[PDB]
Design an enzyme around this catalytic site. Structure first.
Site, PDB file in Angstrom:
ATOM      1  N   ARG A  54      -8.907 -80.003   5.307  1.00 42.69           N
ATOM      2  CA  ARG A  54     -10.222 -80.250   5.890  1.00 42.69           C
ATOM      3  C   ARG A  54     -11.101 -79.012   5.751  1.00 42.69           C
ATOM      4  NH1 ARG A  54     -12.352 -83.368  10.483  1.00 42.69           N
ATOM      5  NH2 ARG A  54     -11.091 -82.275  12.056  1.00 42.69           N
ATOM      6  N   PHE A  59     -18.381 -74.723  10.290  1.00 42.35           N
ATOM      7  CA  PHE A  59     -17.569 -74.997  11.471  1.00 42.35           C
ATOM      8  C   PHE A  59     -16.174 -74.401  11.277  1.00 42.35           C
ATOM      9  CE2 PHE A  59     -14.930 -78.463  13.686  1.00 42.35           C
ATOM     10  CZ  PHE A  59     -14.815 -77.726  14.849  1.00 42.35           C
ATOM     11  N   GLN A  62      -9.323 -76.130   7.711  1.00 42.32           N
ATOM     12  CA  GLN A  62      -7.989 -76.368   8.247  1.00 42.32           C
ATOM     13  C   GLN A  62      -6.976 -76.521   7.117  1.00 42.32           C
ATOM     14  OE1 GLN A  62      -7.862 -79.365  11.368  1.00 42.32           O
ATOM     15  NE2 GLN A  62      -5.619 -79.458  11.292  1.00 42.32           N
ATOM     16  N   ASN A 101      -2.994 -78.216  16.628  1.00 35.97           N
ATOM     17  CA  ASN A 101      -1.922 -78.834  17.397  1.00 35.97           C
ATOM     18  C   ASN A 101      -2.224 -80.298  17.674  1.00 35.97           C
ATOM     19  OD1 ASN A 101      -3.430 -79.099  19.962  1.00 35.97           O
ATOM     20  ND2 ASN A 101      -3.282 -76.859  20.065  1.00 35.97           N
ATOM     21  N   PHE A 112      -6.340 -73.240  11.593  1.00 33.30           N
ATOM     22  CA  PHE A 112      -7.694 -73.278  11.065  1.00 33.30           C
ATOM     23  C   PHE A 112      -8.348 -71.908  11.107  1.00 33.30           C
ATOM     24  CE2 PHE A 112      -9.896 -73.524  15.226  1.00 33.30           C
ATOM     25  CZ  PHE A 112      -8.865 -73.951  16.039  1.00 33.30           C
ATOM     26  N   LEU A 121     -13.276 -74.468  22.073  1.00 32.16           N
ATOM     27  CA  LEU A 121     -11.875 -74.594  21.671  1.00 32.16           C
ATOM     28  C   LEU A 121     -10.958 -73.650  22.449  1.00 32.16           C
ATOM     29  CD1 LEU A 121     -12.206 -74.897  17.785  1.00 32.16           C
ATOM     30  CD2 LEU A 121     -12.127 -76.727  19.487  1.00 32.16           C
ATOM     31  N   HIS A 125      -6.474 -74.215  21.788  1.00 32.08           N
ATOM     32  CA  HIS A 125      -5.774 -73.736  20.599  1.00 32.08           C
ATOM     33  C   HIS A 125      -5.475 -72.254  20.738  1.00 32.08           C
ATOM     34  CE1 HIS A 125      -8.022 -77.316  19.187  1.00 32.08           C
ATOM     35  NE2 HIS A 125      -6.904 -77.531  18.519  1.00 32.08           N
TER      36      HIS A 125
END
Length: 164
Positions: A54, A59, A62, A101, A112, A121, A125
């Site tokens: 991804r 942003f 990943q 996760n 990421f 976030l 994470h």
């Protein structure tokens, strides 16, 4: 001393360059060690030839699913999953390295790289490092990314390991 690790990135038919990352073993020693060992491949598996599945421009990117290659799999040096070590480090800006996760205490190999500040976030994470060189290479990935995250050409970790 804080581990220094790298990815050499190939995007489609072109070598994109090297991403160098500093791992915060001072804060999250277990999580940093997992990532370091997966970079060197010292346990017999790891990120070598793994893809970034991804890429969302501005942003994050990943990757790290070396088991299934599609974001559904992965494993750590500790087993299929390991606990969230702590949430002391923040997603405070470009280049922050954090564990993907599937809920609390499900860390494996997927990670990421943030390309913006994402405070929302924090506490979800485990942050464990940061890109220190090759920020341009992370940004280069955007050429094959999309708003949905779908990747347009293979983004492969052609080589990885640890640096002095």
């Amino acid at each position: 001393n804080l581990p220094r690790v790298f990815f050499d990135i190939r995007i489609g038919n072109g070598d994109a360059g090297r991403i160098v990352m500093e791992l915060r073993s001072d804060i999250v020693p277990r999580t940093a060690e997992n990532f370091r060992a997966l970079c060197t491949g010292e346990r017999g598996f790891g990120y070598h030839n793994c893809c970034f599945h991804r890429v969302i421009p501005q942003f994050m990117c990943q990757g790290g699913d070396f088991v299934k290659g599609d974001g559904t799999g992965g494993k750590s040096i500790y087993g299929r999953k390991f606990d969230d070590e702590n949430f002391q480090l923040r997603h405070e800006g470009f280049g922050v390295l954090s564990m993907a996760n599937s809920g609390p205490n499900t860390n494996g190999s997927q990670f990421f790289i943030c390309t913006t500040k994402c405070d929302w976030l924090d506490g979800k994470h485990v942050v464990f490092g940061r890109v220190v060189d090759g920020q341009n290479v992370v940004k280069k990935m955007e050429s094959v990314g999309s708003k949905s995250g779908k990747v347009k050409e293979p983004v492969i970790i052609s080589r990885c390991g640890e640096l002095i």
